[PDB]
């Protein structure tokens, strides 16, 4: 059986994409605390200076 | 008439393959990383956990004889316990 | 092959009026691959949703992959009002009776729950026990990896964190945390425990700790995970983060007033303070400084009430007082609790007799002359 070299490309490449996608999607969905929260920090700095002219 | 033909594992099947491979008894695992000490062989912390249960078993087999209790045998090759069951054993 | 701006409505009208559903699926899949790296093309999405989920296998999950990506892209394209009628429409598709397509549906839910304001709108209409139904035994090898990522996505908001406390999902995930099979769900559930604990602005962090972190095999399971040498530095840092917080709260759960709150209010629950060696060693004379009959108030609860589980905590706490104070044996002989512990040793309960055997043997360990 010569399919052992194909079985390497069959399913060991599947272990490549699961660590490619589902580890970067954990990083890509971390914008709820690294993009939304960090936006919530600087809007207080804009509301610190709007509560003098108002 | 042997061959050093390679065999691949995937570390989710590193226990249950090898254990049923060790439930057959035809395999001659050869160490090909000799440039390393007796520690840092990827599992030194957990083989001491088996050794700590080994130390507890060699101690409890001594005190079971000083009270002179008969020992059940029921001699059979059992099922090898999984690492899922391992943490439940030390309890 | 770039610069595609027009002809979007021409592809949309051809997609609806196509009797060849397999060719319409090829029209849909080519639209999905094109929109995988492109911008927005939701009134048409309100029109494409009704023709979708209609008697087709591959076109159902692909349109779901398309419409959620249409929901996950575009600021003005945020259509959470229309997505409320769409999430409940796919909630029957989110039932756990199908096969070979729920994994793509969970991945479609992973993009759908990635939003912030849509997630709080979702969880009110969700009925999140269905996600706990996926946490129930249905062979979740990669399905629980999508499910725990959904729980980690909902653990961002503190207002959603308080609404998430109306379930036992913290201990229902500790059983899944005790699995530790694919070595990636262990990374997801560890940071989700860090997300639920740290990102909650209340005094209910201990309420989320006493549920699963304290009164389950979580702090003990995290001890062996710290002994493990996984290469992921994010999981290695979250392991030290959860150990420092839960190790502080377990120390904070033993302050001898919380033990007094357990004693005076009663019900004598088995807590970590009753088994902690630091709690019995530090609060040794705390019983004697509190008008010592308060220690006999633990004995009065042990003598009068039967309590086949609650008196077991009364037996071990009485022996720890005798072990940390030999003069309390004279105080126990003054209250006569030794004859009460001796009579309670003959109880029919197994754990009550085993706890009373360790206590009564500790009561006569010092042996002053009579």
Swiss-Prot record, chain A:
Coiled coil: none annotated. Disulfide bonds: none annotated. It is found in: Apical cell membrane; Cytoplasmic vesicle, Secretory vesicle, Synaptic vesicle membrane; Cytoplasmic vesicle, Clathrin-coated vesicle membrane. The modification Phosphotyrosine is found at residue 53. Expressed in brain (at protein level). V-ATPase is a heteromultimeric enzyme made up of two complexes: the ATP-hydrolytic V1 complex and the proton translocation V0 complex. The V1 complex consists of three catalytic AB heterodimers that form a heterohexamer, three peripheral stalks each consisting of EG heterodimers, one central rotor including subunits D and F, and the regulatory subunits C and H. The proton translocation complex V0 consists of the proton transport subunit a, a ring of proteolipid subunits c9c'', rotary subunit d, subunits e and f, and the accessory subunits ATP6AP1/Ac45 and ATP6AP2/PRR. Belongs to the V-ATPase E subunit family. Subunit of the V1 complex of vacuolar(H+)-ATPase (V-ATPase), a multisubunit enzyme composed of a peripheral complex (V1) that hydrolyzes ATP and a membrane integral complex (V0) that translocates protons. V-ATPase is responsible for acidifying and maintaining the pH of intracellular compartments and in some cell types, is targeted to the plasma membrane, where it is responsible for acidifying the extracellular environment. This is V-type proton ATPase subunit E 1. The chain holds residues 4 to 57 of 226 of the full protein.
From Swiss-Prot, chain C:
GO terms for cellular component: clathrin-coated vesicle membrane; vacuolar proton-transporting V-type ATPase, V1 domain. Its main location: membrane. Keywords: Cytoplasmic vesicle, Hydrogen ion transport, Ion transport, Membrane, Phosphoprotein, Transport. GO terms for molecular function: proton-transporting ATPase activity, rotational mechanism. Expressed in brain (at protein level). It is a peripheral membrane protein. It is found in: Cytoplasmic vesicle, Clathrin-coated vesicle membrane. GO terms for biological process: endocytosis; pH reduction; proton transmembrane transport. Subunit of the V1 complex of vacuolar(H+)-ATPase (V-ATPase), a multisubunit enzyme composed of a peripheral complex (V1) that hydrolyzes ATP and a membrane integral complex (V0) that translocates protons. V-ATPase is responsible for acidifying and maintaining the pH of intracellular compartments and in some cell types, is targeted to the plasma membrane, where it is responsible for acidifying the extracellular environment. Subunit H is essential for V-ATPase activity, but not for the assembly of the complex. Belongs to the V-ATPase H subunit family. V-ATPase is a heteromultimeric enzyme made up of two complexes: the ATP-hydrolytic V1 complex and the proton translocation V0 complex. The V1 complex consists of three catalytic AB heterodimers that form a heterohexamer, three peripheral stalks each consisting of EG heterodimers, one central rotor including subunits D and F, and the regulatory subunits C and H. The proton translocation complex V0 consists of the proton transport subunit a, a ring of proteolipid subunits c9c'', rotary subunit d, subunits e and f, and the accessory subunits ATP6AP1/Ac45 and ATP6AP2/PRR. Interacts with AP2M1. This is V-type proton ATPase subunit H. It comes from Bos taurus. The gene is ATP6V1H.
């Amino acid at each position: 059986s010569d399919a052992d070299v194909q079985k390497q490309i069959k399913h060991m490449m599947a272990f490549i994409e699961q660590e490619a996608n589902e580890k970067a999607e954990e990083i890509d969905a971390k914008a709820e605390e690294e993009f939304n929260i960090e936006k919530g920090r600087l809007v207080q700095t804009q509301r610190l200076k709007i509560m003098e002219y108002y | 008439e042997m061959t050093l033909a390679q065999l691949f594992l995937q570390s989710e099947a590193a226990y249950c393959c090898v254990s049923e491979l060790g439930e057959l008894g035809k395999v001659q695992f050869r160490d090909l990383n000799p440039d390393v000490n007796v520690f840092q062989r990827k599992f030194v912390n957990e083989v001491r956990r088996c050794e700590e249960m080994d130390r507890k078993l060699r101690f409890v087999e001594k005190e079971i004889r000083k009270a002179n209790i008969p020992i059940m045998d029921t001699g059979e090759n059992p099922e090898v316990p999984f690492p899922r069951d391992m943490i439940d054993l030390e309890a | 092959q770039t610069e595609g701006s027009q002809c979007a409505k021409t592809f949309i009208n051809l997609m609806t009026h196509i009797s060849k559903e397999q060719t319409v699926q090829y029209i849909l899949t080519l639209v999905d691959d094109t929109l995988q790296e492109n911008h927005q093309r939701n009134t048409a999405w309100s029109y494409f949703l009704p023709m979708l989920n209609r008697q087709d296998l591959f076109t159902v999950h692909m349109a779901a992959r398309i419409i959620a990506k249409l929901a996950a892209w575009g600021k003005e394209l945020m259509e959470g009002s229309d997505l409320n009628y769409y999430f409940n429409w796919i909630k029957t598709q989110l039932s756990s009776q199908s096969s070979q397509y729920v994994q793509c549906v969970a991945g479609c839910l992973q993009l759908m729950l990635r939003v912030n304001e849509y997630r709080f709108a979702w969880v009110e209409a969700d009925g999140v026990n269905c996600i706990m139904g996926v946490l129930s035994n249905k062979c979740g090898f990669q399905l629980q990896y999508q499910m725990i990522f959904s729980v980690w996505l909902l653990a961002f908001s503190p207002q959603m964190c308080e609404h998430l406390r109306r379930y036992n999902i913290i201990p229902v995930l500790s059983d899944i945390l005790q699995e530790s099979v694919k070595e990636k769900v262990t990374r997801i559930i560890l940071a989700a425990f860090r997300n639920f604990l740290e990102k909650s602005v209340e005094r209910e962090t201990r309420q989320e700790y006493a549920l699963a972190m304290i009164q389950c095999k979580v702090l003990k399971q995290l001890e062996n995970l710290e002994q493990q040498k996984y290469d992921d530095e994010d999981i290695s840092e979250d392991i030290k983060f959860l150990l420092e917080k839960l190790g502080e709260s377990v120390q904070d759960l033993s302050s001898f007033d919380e033990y007094s709150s357990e004693l005076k209010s009663g019900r004598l629950e088995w807590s970590p303070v009753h088994k902690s060696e630091k709690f019995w060693r530090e609060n040794a004379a705390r019983l004697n400084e509190k008008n010592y009959e308060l220690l006999k108030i633990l004995t009065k609860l042990l003598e009068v009430s039967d309590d086949p589980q609650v008196l077991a905590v009364a037996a071990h706490d009485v022996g720890e007082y005798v072990r940390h104070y030999p003069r309390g044996k004279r105080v126990i002989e003054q209250l006569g609790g030794k004859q009460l512990v001796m009579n309670h040793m003959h109880h029919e309960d197994q754990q009550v007799r085993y706890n009373a055997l360790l206590a009564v043997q500790k009561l006569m360990v010092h042996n002053w002359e009579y």
